[PDB]
């Protein structure tokens, strides 16, 4: 089988797996599930979820517990169990940084500051975050990572592991950069030529060329170089796609670097990361903002002609499930909810308060829409035109439920009109437009009021000028001409519900009558439709 | 087996099936269930309901997807599966009109307006409703319908299919008639002689003879002729009963034609339809009005010496179930709730908000009263005297629950009296009268307060001068002399609960004592009674 690879062309991207585009319908374990005994608490969630790919840590501490004495017993069990369950793997290399810190590095690393130095604050105090200028640290991380890749090269010939995450949420909390003498010497020196060339800047020292951004851009650059070197060394052994994941700053109201994780691939340093680390395939957002506007903004910032969108982590509470739709609609290669196992942990308030079948089912229900067409969607999402939307009002707050209750009948009617309008999305599909609305009956035209809780969305792919592939969830999708018809009329020509078998469309039934009079109405159950529109002459 | 046929005699009617009267205890699928793959979501509901007859579409688009290339693969599967389940079929020919529009006509029909022309408004705009004056449209519909009938002639010798509906809810929304030049020419001309003779009118042009009703009567007449020609051609192949179903106007407050579907068999044009389409066996109301008075009025309007009553569609929400009783009481030949399948659709607000076992059970419970005596009831309903009533107050409406709560103890007592009186119905059964009351204990005489929700009803057939067949549901039925007795007394002589086996009555037990002291009290469980009354001398 050909190696997995990330392709980028015409500003679009595909994760190739076994020689064709692939979508990661993912799940990630909790942080302490990377042991053989924990896997029995992982697989059942994955099965219930319908996930095709598991993201799970492989820790430097577990593979090199004593320097030079490697142990791949976990990776062995993991590969074998994944294959038995017919799922793929993304391994998360928890090493120099996990959430800014070295807790997953071996004891002989994290307890030897002299050999493996920490970031020093401007005031001289030390933080528990390893400096990217530590050359011994880099050499050691690199050597262990290379051994892991050698294990895969020798023992995973069919590429059960399809991607590797290098480190986990790199950066530093509590300072902007390393201010140690070692780091200060490099900061005071000239900005490297390659970076100056790539950003088309005037040469100089860090402070000269970057000014108020020098400290942060420096930390970002040095971390990016470190991760790039690890990535290169591993890829020289087996050239799997590799990526880094970002502890995000709020894109609207970030606060200061150091409050957020300074030096990671935050939106303001993506240009530094892309220049510094050309061997890292993509930079992936970790999404735990619950609210639609902020999530939408993150998706927009991380989807670029030079950056495939991969939602490497997202919260596992109910409101997050619907963000699958815009993720895929942006041409995303994957989506991976965090903490999908029964090892007695919840990261509430980030995720679900309780982990149970209902938690899982919120994601299972949206995965069921994509699984039946995964390869076909993946191809259209690289080579063609796709769209995806989610229900754009968050669930109504208690504060808003009180403001609603004390309103004035004229204010209530007006608020309902405003909500209806906000819950109506328009998409330009070329000759045809779609309108997506949320939370209304399947019959007649009473205006949308939203689902409770917010949960809906829709996917659309263009198959031809007048033909679209459509599936949606707790929503209505309606089609109309994109531009005025010169005395013509229009209608739905045909809607077929069906499936793909061996890449061929098989029709199950035609939607007509009630099922197409009031748009195309979807509940929680999966239906995949091919919709053919027609304008026709009446002259 | 003899062909099914609709008999009419002495102002009464019977649907003959296999040589004897038959009652359709029906169910109708949702509009997009007319495919082999959907049938697995249809049969279980039918079984749970206890229905004996399934109404399901056969679409022109599916049988003639390319002109001249016929495909009966769906009809084949459907016939075979129906027979395996030992049920009968009513096929619904979705063709030139389905709900006023051509969406179920093939693409080569509906997208070719030049060949198959649409209704043109008085202002020159075109509506998506095919004109009944289109001669190509008629020929093409007729040809396909004839092929369907040929399929049944050759492949359904035992008449699994017992009746065919020609079109579905014909007419036009948004205009009263076709105002195209083609139509305007026929409108300006003389009203056809046969119509002038049949309605005993003075000859003239449409506007002269009909005045303010000309536009609507013209559309009705032209549609009726079209449907009659299709019907005749099909019957020449196999002479099954055939009917049309009506998108009803509100009989008390109709609004204007075009707001309602103009040209269909609405109550104000039944005379036009009966004169124009003598080959169509009956005109069937589609009932979605929820309230007792309006439903009752519809049943009254559509039950005529020249029109067998068939409730071809009724809403599937709980309040509609009880209308089975007055339907059968009027000598109706059948009753068919709409949307009885699990294909992920509800026509709420017309039907039930959620489709589940409870939805089905509301109809199952009333069908269980009739199924055990279906052939016996059908014969009595043609040859004899039958009666049927439903609970005449709709379920109490929130607004009324508030008005009741803020009343004055004298106003509450008075309201309760008024309700009790409204919930008491009197029936003249010849020598004996019955009084039916709803929502009271099975013992003693506390006045009726109604069921919650409204749900009760009763069926009575006369077996002899003093003997009646009775079954009822969430109601009390009491008998008394119809005439003052000349110094005689009366009593129940005997009440037997039982069943029919090979057309013979088999007694299970005698109701007496508590069971007959306070009338005949019925809950949700089925009991079929023979009630013999007696007057006796005490002189
Ligand atoms: O549960 C919080 C979550 N935050 C993001 C990190 O990448 C994850 O490992 C985890 O710590
Ligand atoms: O669900 C509404 C119902 N209205 C009446 C039509 O005859 C049916 O086919 C269906 O459209
Ligand atoms: Na456009």
Numbering used by the authors:
A (entry chain H), B (entry chain C): 37 to 575
From the study:
Genome walking in silico revealed the presence of open reading frames encoding a predicted β-galactosidase from glycoside hydrolase (GH) family 35 (CjBgl35A, encoded by locus tag CJA_2707, bgl35A), a predicted TonB-dependent receptor (TBDR, encoded by CJA_2709), and a predicted α-l-fucosidase from glycoside hydrolase family 95 (CjAfc95A, encoded by CJA_2710, afc95A) upstream from the gene encoding the known α-xylosidase CjXyl31A (CJA_2706, xyl31A). The data indicate that CjBgl35A acts strictly as an exo-galactosidase that requires terminal galactosyl moieties on XyGOs. The liberated XyGOs are then imported into the periplasm via the TBDR, where the exo-glycosidases CjXyl31A, CjBgl35A, and CjAfc95A work in concert, together with a currently unidentified β-glucosidase(s), to yield monosaccharides for further catabolism.
In the complex structure, DGJ is located within a deep cavity, approximately at the centre of the proposed active-site cleft. The Kd for this interaction in solution was determined to be 485 ± 42 nM by ITC. DGJ is co-ordinated in this −1 subsite by a complex hydrogen-bonding network mediated by the side-chain groups of residues N67 (interacting with O3), K134 (O3 and O4), N135 (O4), N204 (O2), and N383 (O6). The side-chains of E205 and E349 occupy classical positions expected for the catalytic pair, comprising a proton donor-acceptor and nucleophile consistent with the retaining mechanism expected for all GH35 members. Furthermore, the position of the catalytic proton donor-acceptor residue is consistent with an anti-protonation trajectory. Curiously, the apparent solvent-exposed nature of the non-reducing end of the ligand suggests the possibility to accommodate extended substrates, since the axial 4-OH position of the six-membered ring points directly out into the large cleft. However, in fucosylated XyGOs such as XXFG and XLFG, the pendant fucosyl residue is α(1→2)-linked to the galactosyl residue. Steric considerations therefore explain the requirement for CjAfc95A to first remove the terminal Fuc from such XyGOs before the underlying Gal can be addressed by CjBgl35A. As highlighted above, steric limitations of the CjBgl35A active-site also indicate that CjAfc95A must remove terminal fucosyl residues prior to fully enable degalactosylation by CjBgl35A.
